[PDB]
Amino acid sequence: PNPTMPVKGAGTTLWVYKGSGDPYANPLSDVDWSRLAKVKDLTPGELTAESYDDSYLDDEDADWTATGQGQKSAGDTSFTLAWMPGEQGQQALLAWFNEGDTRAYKIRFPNGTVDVFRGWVSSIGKAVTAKEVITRTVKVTNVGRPSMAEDRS
Amino acid sequence: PNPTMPVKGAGTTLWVYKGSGDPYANPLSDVDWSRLAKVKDLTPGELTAESYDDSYLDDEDADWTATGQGQKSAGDTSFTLAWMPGEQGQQALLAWFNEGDTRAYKIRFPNGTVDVFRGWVSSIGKAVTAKEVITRTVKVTNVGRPSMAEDRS
Amino acid sequence: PNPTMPVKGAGTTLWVYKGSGDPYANPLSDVDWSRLAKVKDLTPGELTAESYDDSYLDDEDADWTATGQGQKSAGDTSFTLAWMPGEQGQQALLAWFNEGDTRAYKIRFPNGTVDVFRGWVSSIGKAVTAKEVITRTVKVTNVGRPSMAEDRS
Amino acid sequence: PNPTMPVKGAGTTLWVYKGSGDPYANPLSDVDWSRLAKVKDLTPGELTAESYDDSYLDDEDADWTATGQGQKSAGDTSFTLAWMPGEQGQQALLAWFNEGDTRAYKIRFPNGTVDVFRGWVSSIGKAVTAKEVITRTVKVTNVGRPSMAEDRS
Amino acid sequence: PNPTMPVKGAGTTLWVYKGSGDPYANPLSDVDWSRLAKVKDLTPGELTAESYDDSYLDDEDADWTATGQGQKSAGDTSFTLAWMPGEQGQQALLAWFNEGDTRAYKIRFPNGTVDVFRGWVSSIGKAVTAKEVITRTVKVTNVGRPSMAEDRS
Amino acid sequence: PNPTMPVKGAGTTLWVYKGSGDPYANPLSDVDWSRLAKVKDLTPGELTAESYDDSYLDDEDADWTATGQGQKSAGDTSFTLAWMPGEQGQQALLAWFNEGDTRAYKIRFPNGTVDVFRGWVSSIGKAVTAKEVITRTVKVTNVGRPSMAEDRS
Amino acid sequence: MKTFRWKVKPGMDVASVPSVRKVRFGDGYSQRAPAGLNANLKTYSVTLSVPREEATVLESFLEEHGGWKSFLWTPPYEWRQIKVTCAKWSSRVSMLRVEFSAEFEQVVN
Amino acid sequence: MKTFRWKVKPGMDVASVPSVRKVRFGDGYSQRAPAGLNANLKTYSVTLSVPREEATVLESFLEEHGGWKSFLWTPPYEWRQIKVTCAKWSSRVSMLRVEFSAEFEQVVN
Amino acid sequence: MKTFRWKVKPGMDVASVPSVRKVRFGDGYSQRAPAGLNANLKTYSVTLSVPREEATVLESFLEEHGGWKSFLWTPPYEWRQIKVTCAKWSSRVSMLRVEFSAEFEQVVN
Amino acid sequence: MKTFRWKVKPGMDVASVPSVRKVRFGDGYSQRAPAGLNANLKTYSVTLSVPREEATVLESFLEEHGGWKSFLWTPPYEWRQIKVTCAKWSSRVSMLRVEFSAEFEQVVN
Amino acid sequence: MKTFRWKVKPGMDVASVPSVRKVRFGDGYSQRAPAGLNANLKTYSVTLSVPREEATVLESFLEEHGGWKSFLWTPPYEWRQIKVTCAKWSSRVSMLRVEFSAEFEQVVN
Amino acid sequence: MKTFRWKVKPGMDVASVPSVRKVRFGDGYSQRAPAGLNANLKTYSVTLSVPREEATVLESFLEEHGGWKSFLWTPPYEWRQIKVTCAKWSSRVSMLRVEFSAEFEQVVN
């Protein structure tokens, strides 16, 4: 577990907060965090930002256009996991979807770093095939400001 | 039949309600449910939702955007089953299409749970191939509130 | 020839009505029906319908959207057949295209069932290749009400 | 040379009219017709038509839509022939492009039938490859009424 | 070097005019022409033309639409060549780009024919790969009237 | 190290300026330049320009369109480097993203020349795979006038 | 009285403005009462699409009546025969079809 | 009085403008006071869609009231029964359904 | 009188409005009658495009007549020769073609 | 006096039209001078989005004041508390949310 | 008299409204006759695009004449030199180019 | 006098209309003369965007002058200092930046 060296993705886990307090403070403790098990694929959201135009008439170098950073935004998070409706985690997931609310979900990595977001559930799907496990596909739209793993170092 | 463990897709059956009463109450009984036979493919609809804007001026953190869940909606259900015009199920399907109506249809899984929806028929197509069986392609548009498998546990 | 059993597509034929009367009545008789021969591929049209919105303010369950069936419509029928300008059928096809008119065309299946539509010709094309038979591609836009095989059963 | 039997595309030749008179009358004579040489590809235009709406309120069957044929139109004819600027045909082709003009061109088939169109030149391109012959890609947009092979029989 | 026979593309070269006068007159002399060396791929622009409409009410044959050639235009020329920043040609290319100007560039073919255009530089890019030569990609937007090889024959 | 001869892409390094002064003056010194480590991919932005219409009525040659260069602009620069949150470079990268700011970044090549740009960060993303290294995908949008390799020669 | 046998196209617009006598000063007490017996007379906005050849017959039918004479017509909206008058109509001639726009006003006489 | 039973599509516009007496003095000072004893009255603007067969019933209902009689209706905005009068209305007749647009003003009478 | 030779591009708008004398009585009854002895006169609105070289001929032809002289023209709408007069016109000069827009009133003179 | 606690949404428009006295005949010499002390009073065009349940409270707050009474509000544009009056407001009811549009005019008294 | 040497952009609009005397009461007999010798005077709506540096020269040329003085200009429409006056012009400044819009009116004097 | 410092975004509109005294005689002849001794005065229309924190400074600067005092400013159009006055202005407050709209009339005073 060396943060300063490349690591493989195997061992990543997904967690859901089910407590009261501030998830951003001490997210390294699993107390008051549930877990979604048997995740097949995970695609974390990409943080983006839009642009405002900053070109004026009074400036001299008008040949080349210029711009500047606008209001940032965090993208959507999608993951596919095995369909086990009898498990507590997926029932909590459906309750999360039905009662539209923003709840914090944590991502843990093989090295000792975690990633915390806040978002509501935007999509739930299913895929049925004769020779494969039934899969539950979920997409979560993040809201607010994330807590990247680089903050705590 | 363990709901808490992953299952394979083989064995899924499709049913159409042909009675009077509440489809959502006791959908585990096959009485008053017809059966569509020999389904080659099945694509359940994906539950989605739209996003309203939750950004104000009076707040302090203006760097990152905010939003929230809006009015949810159920998706479109598609399946392809073999063309058997002499069977009762497909005659019921054509009567369902021609008479604009919304009726409940059940999806049964290898594990002991079912999925119940409600929607009208939006499309019917056919596929003719020289060396393959003629198939009937049906698209059903869901209306209202679904009754997922997680509700009854 | 068992309508209640799956069938392969081999043996499908295409016919064009060239008489006076009601094609929908007794379409099982080939009298007053011409034939288009040597068809390479056949893609029957898909019957569709558009959706209106049925959500109100007075209802209680405002979380999920609702809708309903609108005006149905029949899609386009496309087939590709070998190019023989000397045959009567293709000359009748060209006369059909030039004189914009709605004429009934019948599709016959290996099992004892037929499908009758009505439409004008919307496209005629050709493909020339050095080592393949010259092909004539036709697309017909259906108009009105079709007569599917499930009606007569 | 049997029109009533399928033929292979090999042997198709392209001709350009360079005379005075009626192109459509006796197009089976090669007098006053030039020839483009060594055509690699040939894609004849597809005759099409637009649809006007034929739905009224006074009719009884409002469940299904209705329509009808409108203005027909001939498509675009494109071919790729080898690059030979010293030949008379390609010089005539460039003069055809530079001078905005509509001229008739004949497509001859292995069976004893010809196809005559009328259109101007809409595009001219070139392709240079290290190990392949330089090709001249030409696109022609038809104007007016074509004269297919089924007319003369 | 026979213009009247097909030729392979190998041997094509690219030249840039660096003198004062009329490039279109005697373009077969390399005096006052620089050269861009080690070209990997070359895609000469395609000459195009737009269409107006020529259908009136007073004419009789209203079934088929008609049109006519509009204002011609020459497309964009793109080529990819090896990145050699120390060479004079690529420095001339960047001076061409920064000082937005229209300059004539000549294409020479294995047969004794040349193609002369006029255009400004519209794009300059780069592609870096670990196991391949660094490549400089250029796109030039032609302006005015070209001088095709068919003119001088 | 021959600028006049083609070179292979292996050995390219990426640097970020962290000093006070003029980045464009003497960019061949590594003092006050940080180094982002283990870059898997790199896609430099493509310099482009927009076209204004130079067509008038008074001119004689109206057959062909005319245009000219307008405002130039530098593109977006994309790279993907191995995920190492403990390294100084990636912490600087996240600080660069979070604080809306335009900073100069240098691209060094196997031959003795450099490329210098100036822009803000427009996107940050992550990719997690079971059997591959976690990577950090960054997109930087250039602002102003770039300083290519051709300038200092 | 001649009859109108042509067929209208989707989108026919029925505008009704009942005639009423109301007196109200400022925001005060308000009184309302009908103006007469046949207070509500609807005006139908119709659109017709007919080929090039058939345009002359429709144009002659509308021109012969003028704005004064009234003909019988049964609207698709309520299916009850009424007497209407067409005071203005506009044609938009195309290559193969002609599109008509007109306003039919219900009349008592 | 009869009650309005049919339902309203989303997009209802509620416009409420009070009436006041304003006097503007020299340097931005002013006098403001309500015009009348009674509270202001809103003007709900509604749109609704009904099938072809049920359009005649609603049209007859709005017709018998004219523009002078008031009927009870419970707006979804506040869910309290009020008295409204429809002075004018229009309908667009499609192939399957008819869409009504009307303005229900509120009256205390 | 000279004849108009050039052809008209599709989209011609034929607007006809008759002139009537209306009196509106109490209970919806009324009096209607034509205003003049002669039949109404249409107002064809046309659009036509000609090459740059031929634009001068059409402009001179419309200029010589001013806004007071009338010329014969056979509209495609009914295919019968009539007398029309063009009070005003406009043109938009492109690179290759000039597009005229004018309104041909019909006069019996 | 009451205070406004709801939060406005992006797009608030602040219009300023200072009151000034100017005399100018034709193009001649022009003289300008202020009209009074509180010459510049801004009107704020706000837009508010609230759920279905909380629309009643905001509507009641805007209604009980009428056009006359004034309340305290701290605009997000300059962050200085001022006294405004809401003379007119309009609501657009949706399935889950209600959208308010109003104009707040600053006042001295 | 100075001349205009700049080149106009595609889309010139030439508007011609001949001056005529017409008398017509109601729908009766109509009489028309020209008002004078130079009845038809066209106004050319031109559009010019010039770089930043050359905007000052064109602006000065249009400013020194004012609305009164007349200059010679050879329109691309008919290629005959005429005397025109520019009474109004608006400039839309961009980053590298300036776009002019003006109306030139033909005059006799 | 204070000088305007903030910069203007592309799209500035410069509108100049001179004042003339025109008389139109019989056959197209006329009399034209300038109305006044002084040259005409342009009216620049500008649009500029500044961050939220700097918006207060610009708003206070424009409010200080009211609509009667003039400030020096050098338009990008011609690069010569002139005297301008802003009679009215508006601003649209977004999340991060405020965008102003104003028209700077040119005054010789």
Side-chain angles (χ1 to χ4, degrees), chain I residues 7-42:
Chain I
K7 299 168 131 73
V8 178
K9 197 159 290 323
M12 182 179 72
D13 187 27
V14 185
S16 84
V17 64
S19 181
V20 292
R21 173 170 61 66
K22 281 185 211 233
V23 175
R24 184 181 140 211
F25 291 137
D27 289 341
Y29 306 109
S30 65
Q31 273 180 9
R32 298 171 306 273
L37 270 160
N38 278 42
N40 64 7
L41 294 174
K42 298 179 178 67

Side-chain angles (χ1 to χ4, degrees), chain G:
Chain G
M1 280 189 143
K2 304 185 182 302
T3 55
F4 201 80
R5 294 281 161 51
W6 292 272
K7 292 181 181 179
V8 295
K9 294 217 94 191
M12 181 196 81
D13 212 340
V14 186
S16 73
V17 187
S19 55
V20 66
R21 297 197 312 251
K22 64 162 311 203
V23 193
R24 176 186 184 181
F25 303 103
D27 303 358
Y29 185 70
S30 59
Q31 294 169 341
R32 298 160 266 99
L37 296 175
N38 308 314
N40 178 47
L41 296 178
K42 309 179 177 106
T43 72
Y44 298 81
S45 306
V46 305
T47 187
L48 283 74
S49 172
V50 291
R52 294 285 298 276
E53 277 76 21
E54 271 86 330
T56 60
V57 188
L58 174 47
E59 177 69 38
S60 172
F61 182 87
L62 290 175
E63 202 295 310
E64 166 204 349
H65 282 76
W68 54 297
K69 282 173 68 177
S70 53
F71 52 93
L72 296 171
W73 175 61
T74 179
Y77 174 40
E78 271 165 300
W79 317 97
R80 294 180 303 183
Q81 207 176 23
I82 49 175
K83 318 173 184 179
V84 295
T85 56
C86 187
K88 64 162 41 183
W89 62 98
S90 171
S91 299
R92 161 151 288 261
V93 179
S94 180
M95 292 286 326
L96 271 167
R97 307 270 289 191
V98 183
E99 183 178 1
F100 274 81
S101 302
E103 301 216 350
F104 295 143
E105 297 184 355
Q106 191 185 1
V107 296
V108 189
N109 281 111

Side-chain angles (χ1 to χ4, degrees), chain K residues 43-97:
Chain K
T43 62
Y44 300 86
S45 307
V46 303
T47 303
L48 283 75
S49 173
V50 291
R52 296 287 298 277
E53 286 77 50
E54 290 145 50
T56 61
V57 190
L58 178 43
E59 178 70 39
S60 173
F61 180 87
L62 292 177
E63 184 153 10
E64 71 154 339
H65 281 80
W68 53 297
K69 283 174 69 177
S70 57
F71 50 93
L72 294 165
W73 176 58
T74 305
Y77 184 40
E78 262 171 18
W79 318 97
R80 293 180 300 183
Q81 207 177 24
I82 45 168
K83 295 177 283 184
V84 296
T85 58
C86 187
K88 64 162 41 73
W89 62 100
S90 172
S91 298
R92 183 170 261 298
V93 176
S94 180
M95 185 90 51
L96 269 63
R97 306 271 291 192

Side-chain angles (χ1 to χ4, degrees), chain D residues 38 47-48 70-74 82-87 90-91 94 96-102 120-134 136-137 141-146, chain E residues 3-12 41-52 55 61-70 72-73 109-111 113 115 145 148-153:
Chain D
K38 296 201 188 178
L47 292 70
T48 46
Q71 259 199 314
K72 309 158 200 62
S73 51
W83 199 57
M84 292 145 67
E87 199 204 345
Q90 308 201 18
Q91 303 214 130
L94 271 293
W96 188 10
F97 175 49
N98 290 289
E99 162 178 40
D101 191 349
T102 67
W120 48 283
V121 177
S122 178
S123 170
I124 285 173
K126 188 182 288 184
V128 179
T129 316
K131 303 232 171 183
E132 299 171 357
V133 183
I134 297 169
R136 171 76 99 208
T137 68
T141 295
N142 301 356
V143 56
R145 193 176 177 299
Chain E
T4 77
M5 291 275 308
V7 65
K8 273 176 179 48
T12 302
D41 188 353
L42 171 58
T43 311
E46 43 168 0
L47 293 75
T48 75
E50 76 176 22
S51 59
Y52 69 89
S55 50
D61 205 10
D63 301 359
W64 299 78
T65 79
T67 184
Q69 191 161 2
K72 302 161 196 62
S73 50
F109 290 118
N111 47 37
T113 55
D115 282 355
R145 184 161 171 309
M148 291 325 317
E150 283 88 1
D151 281 20
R152 313 170 290 281
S153 181

Side-chain angles (χ1 to χ4, degrees), chain E residues 58-99:
Chain E
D58 292 331
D59 49 36
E60 284 196 357
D61 205 10
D63 301 359
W64 299 78
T65 79
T67 184
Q69 191 161 2
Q71 186 178 3
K72 302 161 196 62
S73 50
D76 300 334
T77 292
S78 65
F79 48 90
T80 183
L81 59 84
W83 187 54
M84 301 155 308
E87 199 205 343
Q88 183 62 255
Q90 297 184 2
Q91 294 157 9
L93 280 172
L94 277 296
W96 187 3
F97 181 55
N98 296 252
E99 190 266 330

Side-chain angles (χ1 to χ4, degrees), chain E residues 134-148:
Chain E
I134 299 190
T135 52
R136 172 77 84 185
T137 67
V138 183
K139 186 169 78 72
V140 168
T141 292
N142 302 339
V143 61
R145 184 161 171 309
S147 183
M148 291 325 317

Side-chain angles (χ1 to χ4, degrees), chain B residues 97-98, chain C residues 24 46-48 71-76 102-105 116-120 140-148, chain D residues 52-55 59 61-68:
Chain B
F97 176 49
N98 289 252
Chain C
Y24 293 359
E46 65 182 1
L47 294 76
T48 62
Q71 184 144 350
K72 302 161 198 62
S73 50
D76 300 334
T102 69
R103 286 144 70 156
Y105 62 96
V116 182
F117 299 89
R118 301 163 48 75
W120 47 282
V140 167
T141 291
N142 303 338
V143 56
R145 184 176 176 87
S147 183
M148 294 299 291
Chain D
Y52 78 93
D53 187 300
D54 197 5
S55 196
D59 57 4
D61 202 12
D63 294 78
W64 299 77
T65 80
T67 185

